[PDB]
Amino acid sequence: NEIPKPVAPAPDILRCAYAELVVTDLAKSRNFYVDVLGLHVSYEDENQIYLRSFEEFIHHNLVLTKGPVAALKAMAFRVRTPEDVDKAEAYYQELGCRTERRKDGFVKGIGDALRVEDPLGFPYEFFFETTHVERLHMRYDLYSAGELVRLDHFNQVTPDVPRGRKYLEDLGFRVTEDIQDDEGTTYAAWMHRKGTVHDTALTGGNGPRLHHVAFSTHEKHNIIQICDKMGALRISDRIERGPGRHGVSNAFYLFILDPDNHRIEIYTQDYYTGDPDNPTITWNVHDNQRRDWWGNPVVPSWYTEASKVLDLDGNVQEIIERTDDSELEVTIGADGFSFTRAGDEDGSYHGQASKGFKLG
Amino acid sequence: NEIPKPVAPAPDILRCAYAELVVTDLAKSRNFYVDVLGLHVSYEDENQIYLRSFEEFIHHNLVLTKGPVAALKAMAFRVRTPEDVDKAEAYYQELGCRTERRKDGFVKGIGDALRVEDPLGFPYEFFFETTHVERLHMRYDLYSAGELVRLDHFNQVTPDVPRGRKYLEDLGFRVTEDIQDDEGTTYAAWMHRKGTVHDTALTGGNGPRLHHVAFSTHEKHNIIQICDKMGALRISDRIERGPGRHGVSNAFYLFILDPDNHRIEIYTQDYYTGDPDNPTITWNVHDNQRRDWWGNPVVPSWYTEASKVLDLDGNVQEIIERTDDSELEVTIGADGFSFTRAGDEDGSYHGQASKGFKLG
Amino acid sequence: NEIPKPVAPAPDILRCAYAELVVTDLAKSRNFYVDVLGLHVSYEDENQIYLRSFEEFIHHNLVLTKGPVAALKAMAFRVRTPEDVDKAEAYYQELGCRTERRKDGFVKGIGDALRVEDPLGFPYEFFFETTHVERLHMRYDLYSAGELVRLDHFNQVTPDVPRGRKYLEDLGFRVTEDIQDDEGTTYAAWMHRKGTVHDTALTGGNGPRLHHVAFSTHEKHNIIQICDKMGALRISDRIERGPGRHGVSNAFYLFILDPDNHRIEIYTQDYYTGDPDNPTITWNVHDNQRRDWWGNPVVPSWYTEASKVLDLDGNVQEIIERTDDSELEVTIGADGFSFTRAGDEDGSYHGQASKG
Amino acid sequence: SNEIPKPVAPAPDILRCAYAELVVTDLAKSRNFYVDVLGLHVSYEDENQIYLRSFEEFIHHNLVLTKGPVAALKAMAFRVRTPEDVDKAEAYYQELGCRTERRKDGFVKGIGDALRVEDPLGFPYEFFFETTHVERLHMRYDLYSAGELVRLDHFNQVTPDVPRGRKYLEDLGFRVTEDIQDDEGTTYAAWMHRKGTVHDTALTGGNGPRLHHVAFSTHEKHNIIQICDKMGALRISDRIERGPGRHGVSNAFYLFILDPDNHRIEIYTQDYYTGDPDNPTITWNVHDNQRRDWWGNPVVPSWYTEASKVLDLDGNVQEIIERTDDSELEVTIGADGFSFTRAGDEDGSYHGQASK
């Protein structure tokens, strides 16, 4: 069931700007994002923490909101002009979606804002106006050895990737890289507005769920330092996967889990995608260098676990089951297969993960 | 069982200096060590390749010798003076070990040398004299993105770690770190002469076998580049384990396998151990940050696979079985366990490895 | 002398894309750019070498063209669509500028291209069509310890910075950072299309001349390696300035000199500027942390030396003298002044450069 | 005949440089520099002293800041291998005719039995073995700073007659690794080691005795860059004296900075292994412009002429003896000096002038 291209013009989206995450214990979450990860506090009170990255000038990149059920409450994109908020509203209304408009914003530091239940069941916000704050990009007196310098992207779990992909292309995101097989199945797609590999991405699975939010560092050693620090704090069990080099994106990466199991990616040094004919790279799902370029196995939790998302009323969205093939199953499951070198049996894996591991 | 301390004085050992490895196909080994890893050729012909690291001034750190069966032929330590080779000869004769003395060396670029079949079945060489070559430490016109700058250590698999440790202590090696359990079994020990964490190390297991030879890089990014390069060359299947941060040693590391399955470690940034009261560090075998500080699982091959070693006639030394508990079995096997925080059930793994994998 | 805003719509410029440099000895230049700096050859013949950075997919980022006088021949920007090359043509005509349009390109690997002598006397090219090549961004088998990964920007020397700034703003470039004094003089401005600090910059001085072309590395150590390699090759005399951390741009940098003295910057880790209200940063010209954040002195040659530029016929553009104050003279000349802390005499410099 | 005769008494077995005691005039300002700016770790403090250690250290401290009226080095301390080596050090310096002081309970907190001496070159050396062990912070990445100082690496002493001091240090078991000489036979500097790095101390030709600097190492080059960046952000870039750079001698990445009393601190990383007894000694020509900074960056005159006072055992300032051998400053960057990039080549050489 294809999502039609509206007649109304798409809003001009600049970039991913922030996420609002609902958390169950604010103090424990603050300890994770401020004390462990070093994000900068823009505002806080008893109910909310507003956090930003080292180079950000908008009010925040992350809002932690106390609530009963941990979930993604909104993924927010900044648009180019105030008038793009009107465009967003008309666009989503034509798509048949629920929309909510607040002239004074939903969260502090954001002005006129539109939140929508998009056609994949995701809570998207579009805004232009935001309170500028001190841009800390040269505050080396604050710089941490693991400093998170920007918000980079979101990653969304959704059951039908081509359906979502077409809708995001209409909205103006261009696909930079994807994962497919020779039987017609799409497992994942990465798409951008701002000229990095992505602003959001679709990962095939039961959804809507939020796979992760990603922040970048300047250098690879900053990511290693996050791991080293987590060991020193004796919370290495909260390192889910990595560090590694991605095939898709070519970025150095790490996946870690917050106190409510919301997944955060730390990412650095992908490439420029701003040209309109930027070459799209398609990887085969059975290529064992596609997710970790060094062939390290992808733990099953990476495929199966992700965050609930909320509707505009704050209720959890119902999960829709993926009927397409499962990336986990076709690569590391019982009938799974992966290769190091296409057409070579040597360095291939049958019914198990790479490097001597099987599904727990 | 105990190896008695000789009356004769121990030779004064400076450091690990080189290893002679037998390889089955010299051209494929050359491609690995020179083309992929960038070691520098000191001499080569149809029978052998002599290699050194970027900062070395003695003739070589690695001798690749063509032969029928891939194996360790000699692990060589440089001693402080010519007279120390005579001391080594009297010491090992008093231990009742087979010795062989050659006034003009066993390999090119080494003069007066003593090879011995040591009490643990290992072929050790001791020498002083060596041919000096151009020290390439400032040849940044040659420097690779993955440059190996020094030879750091060896690691030996032996069935009885305390027996081996005591013998190495009598030789003047001082233990820096070890791994034990609460019921008094030792699984591994690291010991040094030069003022780093180790020059050699003992891993509990069936032996004698050589676990690995280790080279250093200057920085962590150099190790990441070795991985990246192996991905580009589509030999990621030869990355056995890593990259990571060690617990023991605190060094950043990677383990890779040469064309004959000889294991090479790439290592950087351990600490100073030259003071005679340098504090020892004992880890518990079930501490999941002891080998990889980030808790990443140790691949089973790391525990079970190792190189054959040769006796002084070039025949393979018979293997003696370990009867103490297995590190693999007590940590990641069906009956094993490991913890992130001592005492804490959260972040503990029972009957499987960390991060969600079981043994393949 | 104000350059009027045309009625015709400006072209939609994506980014700086390539420079064409005339060089006098193709072999010596090849050695510098390929052997020393490790740039990748897309094409080469007896008269020209076409080079690209590690992550590029268009044909080239740099064209070295043999000729009698070393100079900038074209600074090229890619536009979003084929129809934007028409927009660029109608725009520069209305500006009264000389233009030349070639459906098959001026250099190999570029299709329909427009060249112009712009109102500041610089040879700009606008194009969409380019021959795609193998993007080498994951070819870590080729990756050098000093690897240049992207083309980042150009920097132009021009006598009147406000004049040039207004023209580039009308053209769609937004100022990210600039250097001014409290007497109303502007010494420099940086401006962007692609969302880094700049695609081009204006440096106040006698012009038109090209100050430098800049390539990125992934990390700071890659720039260090470039220096270390130049010492090993015993060509450290071709390191002009750096390495350092910029005040303006916040980027780690190095300036070196090619065999014809064309200045090349290596640059890494500036910040994101793609929001349309990106805060502009204005530095005072006397702030000694503005160019080198660590306060290292800027050598006079950096201010006085720059490359000649050619007009559309291949002749050197005549240089027009700057009449506004000189950044060299007001900071490090005999009556110069700079400070470490605004208002503090301690750590200030009178009539000389910082650090002794 | 001015020679320092080798004693018949055996030399103490010296392991490494271990700590320095620096007298500072304003303890709070000094604490801000060493703790807040540089990130050293507090091992003990009170209203008179601050005891500080690096990230990987297990002995009590690497730096003792002592409040006093006149900023000076009070002691440069080396750890010896055994308690009996302190007895050896006493017999050895007594035979040299040096003034000595033995305190069985130490001179500073966390050190036990210790000997201080006014050595033949006028420097206050300490020899101890006994020290209180503390928590080794090597894996405390929860404390690790972007600019983390991980070890104490070395001292550098200014002395007028380098061969005279060098032979005295060789007798004490220090081995020269590198030096700087000219064709006429003058020695300008020498570096010498006990522990297996390029040096534990070094001698710089000049008026002495003065302490040139104390040096700490970082893990990687980016940690040094970060010190510079932090000092820029704190607007104290005027306290960055020289660097950052690649050294010729030692091949280490380096930075020189100045504490509140103008004590010079080097930050240093990635020299090479020197533990073999026939470690090749490297001699550089004083006119080689890559010997100090490998990239050819000039050495600011203050690096050659400024250094800290040292104290005698009563706490008074040691009188200075002026160098009569040729001055490295004068022969390289002074009115009659010169330096080269490539030996014998006028291109890239500097006459009566520093580089760049």
Ligand SMILES: O=C(O)Cc1ccc(O)c(O)c1
């Ligand atoms: O650059 C120089 O001045 C030579 C040099 C080398 C090593 C050092 O530790 C040092 O202080 C000085």
Ligand SMILES: [Ca+2]
């Ligand atoms: Ca198939």
Ligand SMILES: [Cl-]
């Ligand atoms: Cl992935």
Ligand SMILES: [Cl-]
């Ligand atoms: Cl290990």
Ligand SMILES: [Cl-]
């Ligand atoms: Cl600048």
Ligand SMILES: [Fe+2]
């Ligand atoms: Fe991601």
Ligand SMILES: [Fe+2]
């Ligand atoms: Fe090892």
Ligand SMILES: [Fe+2]
């Ligand atoms: Fe620039």
Ligand SMILES: [Fe+2]
């Ligand atoms: Fe030094």
